[PDB]
Protein backbone atom coordinates (compact mmCIF):
# COMPACT_ATOMS: atom_id res chain seq x y z
CA UNK A 1 0.00 0.00 0.00
CA UNK A 2 1.14 3.58 -0.77
CA UNK A 3 -0.80 5.09 2.22
CA UNK A 4 0.62 5.40 5.70
CA UNK A 5 -2.16 5.57 8.27
CA UNK A 6 -1.99 7.66 11.38
CA UNK A 7 -4.16 9.26 14.00
CA UNK A 8 -4.04 12.00 16.59
CA UNK A 9 -6.18 13.92 19.06
CA UNK A 10 -7.08 17.06 20.85
CA UNK A 11 -7.02 15.82 24.43
CA UNK A 12 -9.16 18.05 26.63
CA UNK A 13 -10.23 18.31 30.25
CA UNK A 14 -12.90 20.25 32.10
CA UNK A 15 -10.87 22.63 34.27
CA UNK A 16 -10.34 28.44 34.59
CA UNK A 17 -10.20 31.11 32.83
CA UNK A 18 -11.45 28.30 30.60
CA UNK A 19 -14.21 25.76 30.88
CA UNK A 20 -12.17 23.49 28.61
CA UNK A 21 -8.37 23.16 28.49
CA UNK A 22 -6.45 21.22 25.87
CA UNK A 23 -3.08 19.48 26.08
CA UNK A 24 -0.23 20.76 23.99
CA UNK A 25 2.90 18.58 23.98
CA UNK A 26 6.60 19.32 23.46
CA UNK A 27 8.42 16.71 21.39
CA UNK A 28 12.20 16.53 21.76
CA UNK A 29 12.61 14.69 18.46
CA UNK A 30 11.62 17.82 16.59
CA UNK A 31 11.67 20.54 19.26
CA UNK A 32 8.14 21.42 18.62
CA UNK A 33 4.77 22.01 20.30
CA UNK A 34 2.06 19.83 18.81
CA UNK A 35 -0.83 17.42 19.42
CA UNK A 36 -0.55 13.76 20.33
CA UNK A 37 -0.39 11.65 17.14
CA UNK A 38 1.22 8.63 15.64
CA UNK A 39 1.17 5.99 13.00
CA UNK A 40 -1.07 2.92 13.38
CA UNK A 41 0.52 -0.15 14.88
CA UNK A 42 -0.22 -3.54 13.35
CA UNK A 43 -3.89 -4.56 13.45
CA UNK A 44 -5.10 -1.17 14.71
CA UNK A 45 -7.71 1.07 13.33
CA UNK A 46 -7.47 4.86 13.66
CA UNK A 47 -9.58 5.33 16.80
CA UNK A 48 -7.48 2.73 18.65
CA UNK A 49 -4.25 4.38 17.51
CA UNK A 50 -5.59 7.73 18.75
CA UNK A 51 -6.38 6.34 22.18
CA UNK A 52 -3.05 4.54 22.37
CA UNK A 53 -1.08 7.63 21.28
CA UNK A 54 -2.85 9.77 23.83
CA UNK A 55 -1.81 7.38 26.55
CA UNK A 56 1.76 7.03 25.22
CA UNK A 57 2.35 10.75 24.77
CA UNK A 58 0.37 12.29 27.64
CA UNK A 59 -0.01 9.53 30.22
CA UNK A 60 -3.77 10.01 30.11
CA UNK A 61 -6.56 7.59 29.49
CA UNK A 62 -9.22 9.16 27.28
CA UNK A 63 -12.51 8.56 25.53
CA UNK A 64 -12.81 9.69 21.92
CA UNK A 65 -15.66 11.89 20.70
CA UNK A 66 -16.19 13.91 17.52
CA UNK A 67 -13.83 13.45 14.63
CA UNK A 68 -11.88 16.64 13.78
CA UNK A 69 -10.75 16.08 10.21
CA UNK A 70 -7.70 14.74 8.46
CA UNK A 71 -4.36 16.05 7.31
CA UNK A 72 -2.39 14.52 4.44
CA UNK A 73 1.32 14.78 3.62
CA UNK A 74 3.39 13.57 0.70
CA UNK A 75 5.67 10.70 1.49
CA UNK A 76 8.09 8.99 -0.89
CA UNK A 77 5.76 5.98 -1.47
CA UNK A 78 2.59 8.04 -1.63
CA UNK A 79 0.62 9.77 1.13
CA UNK A 80 0.49 9.78 4.92
CA UNK A 81 -3.02 10.47 6.26
CA UNK A 82 -3.66 11.51 9.87
CA UNK A 83 -7.23 11.46 11.29
CA UNK A 84 -7.93 13.47 14.40
CA UNK A 85 -10.47 13.20 17.24
CA UNK A 86 -11.52 15.17 20.27
CA UNK A 87 -10.81 13.07 23.34
CA UNK A 88 -11.79 13.69 26.94
CA UNK A 89 -9.20 12.86 29.56
CA UNK A 90 -10.55 10.24 31.96
CA UNK A 91 -7.51 9.75 34.18
CA UNK A 92 -3.78 9.36 34.38
CA UNK A 93 -0.88 11.72 34.84
CA UNK A 94 1.80 13.06 32.61
CA UNK A 95 5.42 11.94 33.15
CA UNK A 96 8.10 13.37 30.93
CA UNK A 97 10.25 11.21 28.86
CA UNK A 98 12.41 11.40 25.73
CA UNK A 99 9.32 11.26 23.40
CA UNK A 100 7.32 14.02 25.11
CA UNK A 101 9.24 16.01 27.73
CA UNK A 102 6.63 18.67 28.55
CA UNK A 103 2.87 18.99 28.46
CA UNK A 104 0.87 22.10 29.09
CA UNK A 105 -2.87 22.43 29.63
CA UNK A 106 -4.15 25.59 28.03
CA UNK A 107 -7.44 27.29 27.15
CA UNK A 108 -8.07 26.99 23.46
CA UNK A 109 -6.87 30.50 22.44
CA UNK A 110 -3.60 30.07 24.33
CA UNK A 111 -3.20 26.58 22.86
CA UNK A 112 -3.66 28.10 19.42
CA UNK A 113 -0.78 30.46 20.16
CA UNK A 114 1.41 27.60 21.43
CA UNK A 115 1.00 25.24 18.41
CA UNK A 116 3.83 25.45 15.89
CA UNK A 117 2.00 24.05 12.91
CA UNK A 118 -0.88 25.30 10.75
CA UNK A 119 -2.27 21.74 10.43
CA UNK A 120 -2.52 21.43 14.23
CA UNK A 121 -4.14 24.85 14.49
CA UNK A 122 -6.66 23.83 11.87
CA UNK A 123 -7.54 20.79 13.90
CA UNK A 124 -7.96 23.02 17.01
CA UNK A 125 -10.20 25.39 14.98
CA UNK A 126 -12.34 22.39 14.17
CA UNK A 127 -12.41 21.41 17.81
CA UNK A 128 -13.68 24.81 18.93
CA UNK A 129 -16.42 25.14 16.30
CA UNK A 130 -18.82 22.65 18.04
CA UNK A 131 -19.22 21.23 21.53
CA UNK A 132 -16.92 18.48 22.71
CA UNK A 133 -18.70 17.29 25.86
CA UNK A 134 -20.71 14.94 23.70
CA UNK A 135 -22.62 11.74 24.07
CA UNK A 136 -21.86 9.12 21.48
CA UNK A 137 -24.20 6.86 19.57
CA UNK A 138 -22.44 4.22 17.44
CA UNK A 139 -24.41 2.93 14.49
CA UNK A 140 -22.82 -0.15 13.00
CA UNK A 141 -23.62 -2.01 9.78
CA UNK A 142 -23.28 -5.81 10.26
CA UNK A 143 -20.23 -7.47 8.89
CA UNK A 144 -20.00 -9.48 5.75
CA UNK A 145 -22.51 -12.34 5.71
CA UNK A 146 -22.44 -13.69 2.14
CA UNK A 147 -25.24 -13.29 -0.39
CA UNK A 148 -28.96 -13.08 0.33
CA UNK A 149 -31.24 -16.13 0.32
CA UNK A 150 -34.56 -16.37 -1.45
CA UNK A 151 -36.21 -17.73 1.74
CA UNK A 152 -36.92 -14.91 4.17
CA UNK A 153 -36.49 -16.89 7.39
CA UNK A 154 -33.19 -18.35 6.14
CA UNK A 155 -31.98 -14.94 5.04
CA UNK A 156 -32.85 -13.35 8.39
CA UNK A 157 -30.76 -16.04 10.20
CA UNK A 158 -27.78 -15.79 7.84
CA UNK A 159 -24.62 -15.65 9.91
CA UNK A 160 -21.41 -13.76 9.31
CA UNK A 161 -18.86 -15.26 7.00
CA UNK A 162 -15.19 -15.68 7.93
CA UNK A 163 -14.35 -12.17 6.92
CA UNK A 164 -17.37 -10.85 8.87
CA UNK A 165 -16.33 -12.70 11.99
CA UNK A 166 -12.84 -11.04 11.70
CA UNK A 167 -14.57 -7.69 11.29
CA UNK A 168 -16.68 -8.32 14.42
CA UNK A 169 -13.52 -9.12 16.44
CA UNK A 170 -11.69 -6.01 15.13
CA UNK A 171 -14.68 -3.81 16.07
CA UNK A 172 -14.26 -4.41 19.76
CA UNK A 173 -11.29 -2.11 20.41
CA UNK A 174 -12.56 0.38 17.88
CA UNK A 175 -15.90 0.82 19.53
CA UNK A 176 -14.41 0.77 23.00
CA UNK A 177 -12.29 3.78 22.00
CA UNK A 178 -15.57 5.73 22.02
CA UNK A 179 -16.63 4.45 25.42
CA UNK A 180 -19.41 2.09 24.24
CA UNK A 181 -21.45 0.84 27.16
CA UNK A 182 -24.77 -0.53 25.94
CA UNK A 183 -25.60 -2.72 22.97
CA UNK A 184 -28.58 -3.03 20.61
CA UNK A 185 -29.04 -4.99 17.47
CA UNK A 186 -31.68 -5.42 14.76
CA UNK A 187 -33.57 -8.72 14.93
CA UNK A 188 -31.22 -10.48 12.52
CA UNK A 189 -28.50 -13.01 13.47
CA UNK A 190 -25.79 -11.20 11.50
CA UNK A 191 -26.50 -7.93 13.37
CA UNK A 192 -26.20 -9.56 16.78
CA UNK A 193 -23.11 -11.52 15.72
CA UNK A 194 -21.32 -8.39 14.64
CA UNK A 195 -21.43 -7.00 18.15
CA UNK A 196 -21.22 -10.27 20.09
CA UNK A 197 -17.44 -9.98 20.55
CA UNK A 198 -18.02 -6.53 22.07
CA UNK A 199 -20.81 -7.93 24.22
CA UNK A 200 -18.39 -10.57 25.46
CA UNK A 201 -15.73 -7.95 26.20
CA UNK A 202 -18.13 -5.68 28.04
CA UNK A 203 -20.25 -8.46 29.65
CA UNK A 204 -23.29 -6.66 28.35
CA UNK A 205 -26.41 -8.21 26.90
CA UNK A 206 -27.44 -7.16 23.38
CA UNK A 207 -30.95 -5.70 23.33
CA UNK A 208 -32.94 -7.03 20.38
CA UNK A 209 -34.52 -4.54 18.00
CA UNK A 210 -37.33 -5.63 15.72
CA UNK A 211 -38.08 -2.01 14.80
CA UNK A 212 -34.66 -1.62 13.20
CA UNK A 213 -34.90 -4.30 10.55
CA UNK A 214 -35.47 -3.71 6.85
CA UNK A 215 -38.78 -5.54 7.22
CA UNK A 216 -39.87 -2.98 9.79
CA UNK A 217 -38.54 -0.17 7.64
CA UNK A 218 -40.66 -1.40 4.73
CA UNK A 219 -43.70 -0.95 6.98
CA UNK A 220 -42.85 2.35 8.64
CA UNK A 221 -39.89 4.29 7.28
CA UNK A 222 -39.71 6.20 10.53
CA UNK A 223 -40.93 4.07 13.54
CA UNK A 224 -37.26 3.26 13.34
CA UNK A 225 -36.12 6.91 13.44
CA UNK A 226 -38.14 7.19 16.58
CA UNK A 227 -36.49 4.07 18.05
CA UNK A 228 -32.99 5.36 17.37
CA UNK A 229 -33.92 8.60 19.07
CA UNK A 230 -35.38 6.66 22.02
CA UNK A 231 -32.17 4.63 22.37
CA UNK A 232 -30.05 7.82 22.05
CA UNK A 233 -31.91 9.31 24.99
CA UNK A 234 -30.86 6.66 27.42
CA UNK A 235 -27.73 7.09 29.58
CA UNK A 236 -24.52 5.67 28.28
CA UNK A 237 -23.05 5.31 24.83
CA UNK A 238 -25.00 2.78 22.79
CA UNK A 239 -23.88 0.65 19.87
CA UNK A 240 -26.73 -0.09 17.48
CA UNK A 241 -26.00 -2.75 14.84
CA UNK A 242 -28.39 -2.78 11.92
CA UNK A 243 -28.93 -3.39 8.27
CA UNK A 244 -27.84 -1.58 5.22
CA UNK A 245 -31.05 -0.06 4.03
CA UNK A 246 -31.92 1.45 7.39
CA UNK A 247 -28.68 3.39 7.85
CA UNK A 248 -28.44 5.99 5.03
CA UNK A 249 -31.96 7.21 5.61
CA UNK A 250 -31.53 7.45 9.42
CA UNK A 251 -28.24 9.24 8.95
CA UNK A 252 -29.50 11.57 6.20
CA UNK A 253 -32.68 12.30 8.14
CA UNK A 254 -30.77 13.22 11.24
CA UNK A 255 -28.10 15.19 9.48
CA UNK A 256 -30.77 17.15 7.57
CA UNK A 257 -32.83 17.85 10.65
CA UNK A 258 -29.83 18.84 12.70
CA UNK A 259 -27.91 20.64 9.98
CA UNK A 260 -24.85 18.43 10.31
CA UNK A 261 -22.21 17.71 7.59
CA UNK A 262 -20.61 14.35 7.50
CA UNK A 263 -17.05 14.61 6.31
CA UNK A 264 -17.02 11.09 4.89
CA UNK A 265 -19.83 8.82 3.83
CA UNK A 266 -20.40 5.18 3.12
CA UNK A 267 -22.37 2.19 4.28
CA UNK A 268 -19.92 -0.71 4.01
CA UNK A 269 -20.50 -3.92 5.90
CA UNK A 270 -18.73 -3.53 9.28
CA UNK A 271 -18.60 0.26 9.01
CA UNK A 272 -19.45 2.59 11.89
CA UNK A 273 -21.22 5.92 12.03
CA UNK A 274 -20.09 7.87 15.11
CA UNK A 275 -22.94 10.15 16.07
CA UNK A 276 -22.09 12.82 18.56
CA UNK A 277 -24.80 14.50 20.55
CA UNK A 278 -24.83 17.73 22.62
CA UNK A 279 -27.95 18.24 24.74
CA UNK A 280 -29.81 15.64 22.77
CA UNK A 281 -28.97 17.13 19.34
CA UNK A 282 -26.66 15.81 16.66
CA UNK A 283 -23.37 17.75 16.29
CA UNK A 284 -21.25 15.22 14.36
CA UNK A 285 -21.68 12.21 12.14
CA UNK A 286 -18.38 10.45 11.39
CA UNK A 287 -18.29 7.49 9.04
CA UNK A 288 -15.56 4.96 9.77
CA UNK A 289 -14.51 2.35 7.31
CA UNK A 290 -14.81 -1.35 8.13
CA UNK A 291 -11.90 -2.33 10.25
CA UNK A 292 -10.31 -4.52 7.51
CA UNK A 293 -10.81 -2.05 4.63
Curated annotation (Swiss-Prot):
Q: What happens when the gene is disrupted?
A: 12-fold spontaneous mutation frequency increase by rifampicin resistance screening.
GO BP terms: DNA repair; DNA replication
UniProt key word RNA-binding: no
Q: Which Pfam family, any one of them, does this sequence belong to?
A: His_Phos_1
Describe how the cofactor binds. Answer: Can also use Mn(2+), with lower efficiency.
Which segment of this protein is annotated as the motif Nudix box? 38-59
- GO MF entry, a single one: 8-oxo-GDP phosphatase activity
Keyword Zinc tagged: no
The record places domain Nudix hydrolase at 2-128
Which residues does the annotation say bind substrate?
27-30, 32, 37-39, 73, 80, 99, 117
Query: EC number(s)?
Result: 3.6.1.69, 3.6.1.58, 3.6.1.61
- Describe regulators of its activity: Ap4A hydrolysis is inhibited by fluoride ions.
Which PROSITE patterns does its entry note?
NUDIX (PS51462), NUDIX_BOX (PS00893)
Alphabetical keyword list? DNA damage, DNA repair, DNA replication, Hydrolase, Magnesium, Metal-binding
The record's catalysed reaction(s) read: 8-oxo-dGTP + H2O = 8-oxo-dGDP + phosphate + H(+); 8-oxo-GTP + H2O = 8-oxo-GDP + phosphate + H(+); 8-oxo-dGDP + H2O = 8-oxo-dGMP + phosphate + H(+); 8-oxo-GDP + H2O = 8-oxo-GMP + phosphate + H(+)
SMART domains according to UniProt: PGAM
Identify the CDD domains for this entry: HP_PGM_like, NUDIX_Ap6A_hydrolase
- Which annotated residues bind Mg(2+) 1? 37, 57, 99
Q: Could you say which residues bind Mg(2+) 2 here?
A: 53, 57, 99
Cofactor(s) named in the record: Mg(2+)
The record's note on its domains: Contains an N-terminal Nudix hydrolase domain, followed by a linker region and a C-terminal histidine phosphatase domain. The C-terminal domain is necessary for efficient catalysis by the Nudix hydrolase domain.
Q: Which PANTHER family match?
A: 8-OXO-(D)GTP PHOSPHATASE (PTHR43222:SF9), NUDIX HYDROLASE 23 (PTHR43222)
Function, as annotated, reads: Catalyzes the conversion of 8-oxo-dGTP to 8-oxo-dGDP, and 8-oxo-GTP to 8-oxo-GDP. At high enzyme concentrations, can also catalyze the conversion of 8-oxo-dGDP to 8-oxo-dGMP, and 8-oxo-GDP to 8-oxo-GMP. In addition, catalyzes the hydrolysis of the diadenosine polyphosphates diadenosine hexaphosphate (Ap6A), diadenosine pentaphosphate (Ap5A) and diadenosine tetraphosphate (Ap4A).
Protein name, per record: 8-oxo-(d)GTP phosphatase
UniProt organism field? Mycolicibacterium smegmatis (strain ATCC 700084 / mc(2)155) (Mycobacterium smegmatis)
**Name of the gene:** mutT1
